[PDB]
Amino acid sequence: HRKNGGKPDHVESDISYAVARQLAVNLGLTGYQSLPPGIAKNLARGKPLPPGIAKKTVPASMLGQLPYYPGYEWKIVGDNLVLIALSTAVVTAIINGVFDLE
């Protein structure tokens, strides 16, 4: 059936997670390790990715299916999908859990 989203209080976030998770799973990009505890749930939109935290490359197959904004790039951060401004590493959108184990 369809995924029961409960209350429609963040419908666009639900849609965004669902397609990112479909991409990750169907491309074999699951099982990524989460960020260290203390860092994990604490990325902040409008601030740079914390120092010493890896941002890994998202494959072209997946980047073809996510929106493209000149001057920004989608990255894997822990098990999350994160759009980051090039150069400043300013976190711009965060979709959590996309690359978690299945």
Closest CB to a copy of itself among 13 and 30?
A: 13
- Looking at residues 44 to 63 of the shown chain, list those that interact with a copy of itself (rule: CB under 8 A): 63
Q: Of these, 66, 89, 97, 100, which contacts a copy of itself (CB under 8 A)? A: 66
Distance of closest approach, residue 36 Cβ to a copy of itself, in angstroms:
25
Per-residue HEC secondary structure of 42-70 comes to CCCCCCECCCCCCCEECCHHHHCCCCCCC
Q: Rounded CA gap, 43 and 40, in Å?
A: 7
Q: 94: closest CA among 16, 2, 6, 8?
A: 16
Closest CB to a copy of itself among 5 and 97?
A: 5
**Residue 87 interacting with a copy of itself (CB under 8 A):** no
